[model samples]
Every structure is written in C-alpha cells, then in structure tokens.
Target: MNVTVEVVGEETSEVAVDDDGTYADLVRAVDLSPHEVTVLVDGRPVPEDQSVEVDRVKVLRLIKGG
Candidate 1:
C-alpha cells in the first residue's frame, strides 16, 4: 500500500510512502523534523502514533520557520 504525502507552507511537494508508516515517516521522508513541525490528516492535526491508511489518508506537513 502506498500513501500520499503533501508538504505545506513554503515549498510544497507530494510523495508516496508505505501504508504502515505514520505521519512522522512522511515528514521524515521530506526531511522535516516531527518535533519542529506539525502534521495534519485530512486538514486535522494528528500525532505520530496515528496509523496511516493508504489512498484514504492525506498527510500535510506544516513546516516551522520564523
């Protein structure tokens, strides 16, 4: 199973990952730190423990910057 990953705020890009992976995996896939950033699933924020359902979940990473 392949999951779709989207990055928001600044340069945005979408990638694919395994279904068993969490939002943290997606964030790391884009080289974003989970501690310094936030993740949203279907526009709602979720923790790293949340399971990712492929083709049924949309992951967005809100990058941190000042």
Candidate 2:
C-alpha cells in the first residue's frame, strides 16, 4: 500500500508498505528513531501498539519541556 509521510519541521514524502504496516516501519523509512519521535495518523496520536493502517501519517519529534 502507498502512504504519505510528513515529518514535523521537515518535508513530506511517500512510502510503500504492507497493509499491516506499523508506525515503526514509517519512522524507519525516514531514518528516525521511534524512541525520540512521536507519530500521528490523521492528526491523532497513535498508541504504542497502533498499526499504520491508514494511507497518511505524520511524524513529529518528541519534545521535552520543563
């Protein structure tokens, strides 16, 4: 399946994955670290075990605030 991937403060790109794709796969495609990044699908934050079953996904870095 084809999906759109957008990174916060970065460019958006297209990627291909299986129907049962995962957030990990999406992050990996962009050379991002899942531990240091947060992923959202359709503007909603995804759970740790959530699958990337949608056609579009947004990637954001995990911000640290005091």
Candidate 3:
C-alpha cells in the first residue's frame, strides 16, 4: 500500500505499508511524533491506537498540533 503524509511546512513523505497496517504503523513509518502531530486519513482524523484500511494512495495530512 502507498501512503502519503503531508507535513504542514515540510514536503510530503510517501511510504509503503501493509494491507493490515495500523495508525501507529503509519506514524512510525513517517517518523512523526504522535504527541505533537495529528494524522488524518482521507480527511478523517483517527486515533493513534486504531487500525486503518489504507489502499492505493491514501492522503495522510499531518497537522503540527494535536
């Protein structure tokens, strides 16, 4: 699976993931600090502990503040 994490000021980072990837997986893959950032999967914000279904190209907007 292809995932994109768009940091506010920084350029987006594209990472490959598993079909059963979790939010935490993406967080670590992008090397983001979960406490300082909030992740949105397809414009929908999800908790770090939850599992997400990401297929093809998924837009993961990384907000700087939680």
Candidate 4:
C-alpha cells in the first residue's frame, strides 16, 4: 500500500509497501524503529507486526528525543 506517514512535529513522506507488508513494515519504511514508534490508522492504535489495511497514518514516538 502507498501511505502517507507523518510523525508528529516531524517529517512526512510517501512510501509504498508490498501487498504482504505489515504495519511494522510501515514503521521501517519511515526510517524509525518499530519498538519506539506507534502508528495509528483511522484513530485505532496498531500492533505494528500485524498486517495492514492502512493508508494515511500518524506515527507516534513513545520515547521522545532519543
């Protein structure tokens, strides 16, 4: 899926993941560690390792200013 990944107060980018990709893959595509970030789709917080039906998502970094 082609997605717009926006990190709060950070950069936003367009990325495409393979059809078999999961939400964690989306985190990787944005150059952030999945362990440190959480991406919410349609107001639902996602378990990153799970497969996605996602498009535009907001990336939330739980640990700030590493």
Candidate 5:
C-alpha cells in the first residue's frame, strides 16, 4: 500500500510512501530530516513512533525556523 505525503516547503511536493513505513521511514524517503519535521495523519499531529496506515489523507510538512 502507498500513501501520499505532501511536504509543504517553499513549494509543495507530493511524496508517495509505503503504508508499512514508519514516520522515520517517510522522512528518509522524502530526503528530510526527522528532527526537522512533524508527521500529520490526516491533518493531526502523530507521535514520532506512529506508523503510517493505508488511507487517503493529506500529510503536510510545514517547515519552520527555530
């Protein structure tokens, strides 16, 4: 199963990831740093250790400066 995760940066990009992939895995697949990202499952924040499910939802990655 695959899921679409949208990384909303200076520009938005759609990344297709494996359903069985963990939040960490998706981060790697998208060439993003896990320490610099938040994983949202259907618009809500998910815990770092959470797993991605086979569902059609929008995952947005909002990049911010600390």
Candidate 6:
C-alpha cells in the first residue's frame, strides 16, 4: 500500500506500507517514535497502537525545541 506521513512543522514524507500496518509504522518511516509523536487523521489525533486505515496522515511532535 502507499502510505505517507506529514510532520506538522516540517514536510510530507512518502512511505511504502503493507496491507496491515499500525500508526507506529507511520512515524517510524519518518524517523519518529510512537511515544514521541502522535498520528492525526481528519483533524483528530489517534493512538499509535491502532491500525492505519488512512493512507495519508498528519503527524505532530509531542516535544519540540524552539
């Protein structure tokens, strides 16, 4: 499947995923961790442990440096 992740303050990252993958995979492709970031689909945040239904998702960093 064609999956991608977009870092809120950064850019959109395109990644390849299997039929079944978790949100965790989304962040990892962008060099992020599940606990360190969150997954956002349709303007709402979701858990990392959950499976991914949305091919393209927005990601937000939990901690950022100024």
- Of the candidates shown, which would achieve the greatest lDDT relative to the real structure? 4
lDDT of each: 0.47, 0.55, 0.51, 0.58, 0.50, 0.55
lDDT of 2 by residue, 1-66 (tens): 346677777777555444537755665668654234344557455444555465565656545561
**How close is every model to the real structure, measured as TM-score?**
0.25, 0.36, 0.31, 0.37, 0.27, 0.36
lDDT of 4 by residue, 1-66 (tens): 346777777777544543437765667667764234444566556656566565565666454654
**Candidate 2 TM-score, true structure as reference:** 0.36
Q: What total of clashing residue pairs does each candidate reach?
A: 0, 0, 0, 1, 0, 0
Off by over 4 Å in 3: 15-38, 42-52, 55-66
lDDT of 3 by residue, 1-66 (tens): 445655555676655554447666676667664433343455445445555576323333553354
Residues 1-66 of candidate 6: C-alpha lDDT, one tens digit per residue: 345787767877654443336655666568664334344456456545566555565666554652
| Pairwise lDDT winner, candidates 3 and 5 | 3
The best-first sequence of candidates by lDDT reads 4, 2, 6, 3, 5, 1
Give stretches of model 6 more than 4 Å off.
Answer: 14-36, 43-54, 63-66
Candidate 1 weakest ten by summed lDDT: 55-64
10 residues in a row with least lDDT, candidate 6: 32-41
Q: How close is candidate 6 to the true structure, as a TM-score?
A: 0.36
lDDT of 3: 0.51
Q: Per the 3 Å backbone cut-off, how many clashing residue pairs does candidate 5 have? A: 0
Q: Which whole-number lDDT from 0 to 100 does residue 59 have in model 1?
A: 43
lDDT of 4 at 26: 68
Of 1 and 3, which scores higher on lDDT?
Answer: 3
Task: List the candidate 5 regions with Cα displacement exceeding 4 Å.
Answer: 7-38, 43-53, 57-62
In model 2, which range of ten residues has the least summed lDDT?
A: 32-41
